[PDB]
């Protein structure tokens, strides 16, 4: 299909460049449907050359679902929905999201998707990595799949803003989840928020989660997205993970983002 937009897949795993559409304008049914189809298929989609306003950013995001900001990020003045991924040139230390993860999985219902918009990015440096948890799951052997399919995992934010109160609040998600849009099964673990496999001792859980982390972040499951000014990107927060790359010390980097609300991860 794709008659209203042009789609250029980035890899054989995930990622696709979308052109032939103006995000500054309202989307008709046929065009929106094609975009949603590509999103469900390619999991991370990006649109070069979309110099959209804050308002148009929010409006595009709302097409995916309710705009429900992530807890920990700072919003731009006048727009609670639009939050900042900002690093000054002078700034030093460690970068936001510089390990493989997906957003806010300590929530009973984590975000469904994130709409990111490049405002000011370096000519090179500051790529974002993404990976497919569909592919991570599908590449596990049938025996391993059957072995871990019924496991549940305890998530909490203790490492991000917890002790290590709301940061210590635990929630339980299935280890393998069915995407409510695509119907497709994907692996659902991440080293940032996952604490233990429910019901297992530390000795039992640690090596299994460790393998899954190593498996999921295999290089051949990833894609690498380069940013340019006015690039608008949407990632699926359920079936992908992402990673920032701190290879731009001394350079200014500024992107905004809206967060699309989701429902309980379900088996």
Ligand X SMILES: O=C(O)CCC(=O)C(=O)O
Ligand Y SMILES: C[C@@H](Oc1ccc(Oc2ccc(C#N)cc2F)cc1)C(=O)O
Binding residues for 2-oxoglutarate: 128, 227, 253
Residues forming the annotated binding site?
101, 103, 128, 227, 242, 253
Among ligand Y, Mn ion, a copy of itself, none, what binds residue 159 when CB lies within 5 to 8 Å by partner kind?
ligand Y
Check residue 97 for interaction with Mn ion (CB under 5 A).
yes
The smaller minimum CB distance to ligand X, of residues 155 and 185, is found at: 155
Q: How far is the CB of 97 from ligand Y (least distance, A)?
A: 4
Contact flags string 55-94 toward a copy of itself, x per CB under 8 A: ----------------------------------------
DSSP-assigned beta bridge partners for residue 255: 85, 118
Query: Could you tell me the smallest distance in angstroms from the CB atom of residue 109 to ligand Y?
Result: 13
Residues 164-223 that bind a copy of itself (CB under 8 A): 217, 219-220, 222-223
Rounded CA-CA distance 245/225 in Å is 11
The position carrying tokens 């679902």 is: 65
Whole-angstrom distance, CA of residue 167 vs CA of residue 95: 20
| Dihedral of the alpha carbons of 32, 183, 136, 187, in degrees to the nearest 10 | 110
Cβ at position 90, least distance to ligand Y in Å: 20
**Footprint on this chain of ligand X (rule: CB under 6 A):** 85, 96-97, 103, 128, 242, 244, 257
Question: What is the DSSP code (8-state) at residue 221?
Answer: G
Q: Is 103 in the site for Mn ion (CB under 5 A)?
A: yes
Integer Cα distance of 216 and 120 in angstroms: 31
Q: Is 231 in the site for a copy of itself (CB under 8 A)?
A: no
Which letter, b or e, does each residue of 94-125 get, where b requires 16 or more Cβ atoms within 10 Å of its Cβ?
A: ebebeebbbbbbbbeebbbbbbbbbbebeeeb
**Closest by Cα among 245, 259, 33, 218 to 133:** 218
Binding residues for Fe cation: 101, 103, 242
Q: Are 233 and 40 in contact (CB under 8 A)?
A: no
Residues that bind Mn ion (CB under 5 A): 97, 103
Binding site for a copy of itself (CB under 8 A): 8-13, 98, 100, 122-127, 129, 217, 219-220, 222-224, 243, 245-249
């Amino acid at each position: 299909r794709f008659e209203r937009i042009a789609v250029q897949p980035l890899t054989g795993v995930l990622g696709a460049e979308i052109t032939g559409v103006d995000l500054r304008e309202p989307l008709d049914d046929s065009t929106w449907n094609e975009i949603l189809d590509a999103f469900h298929t390619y999991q991370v989609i990006y649109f070069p050359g979309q110099a959209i306003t804050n308002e148009q950013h929010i409006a595009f995001s709302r097409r995916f679902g309710p705009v429900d900001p992530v807890p920990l990020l700072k919003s731009i003045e006048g727009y609670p929905e639009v939050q900042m991924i900002r690093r000054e040139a002078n700034e030093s230390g460690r970068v936001i999201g510089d390990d493989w993860h997906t957003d806010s999985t300590f929530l009973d219902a984590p975000p469904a998707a994130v709409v990111m918009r490049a405002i000011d990015v370096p000519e090179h440096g500051g790529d974002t990595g993404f990976l497919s948890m569909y592919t991570a799951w599908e590449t596990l052997s049938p025996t391993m799949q059957a072995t871990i399919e019924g496991l549940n995992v305890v998530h909490s934010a203790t490492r991000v803003f917890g002790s290590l109160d709301a940061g210590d609040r635990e929630t339980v998600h299935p280890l393998v989840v069915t995407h409510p849009g695509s119907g497709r099964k994907g692996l659902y673990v991440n080293q940032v928020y996952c604490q233990r496999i429910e019901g297992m001792t530390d000795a039992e859980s640690k090596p299994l989660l460790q393998f899954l982390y190593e498996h999921a972040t295999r290089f051949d499951f990833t894609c690498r997205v380069r940013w340019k000014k006015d690039q608008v990107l949407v990632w699926d927060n359920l079936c992908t993970m992402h990673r920032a790359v701190p290879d731009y010390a001394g350079k200014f980097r500024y992107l905004t983002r809206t967060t699309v609300g989701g429902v309980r991860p379900a088996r």
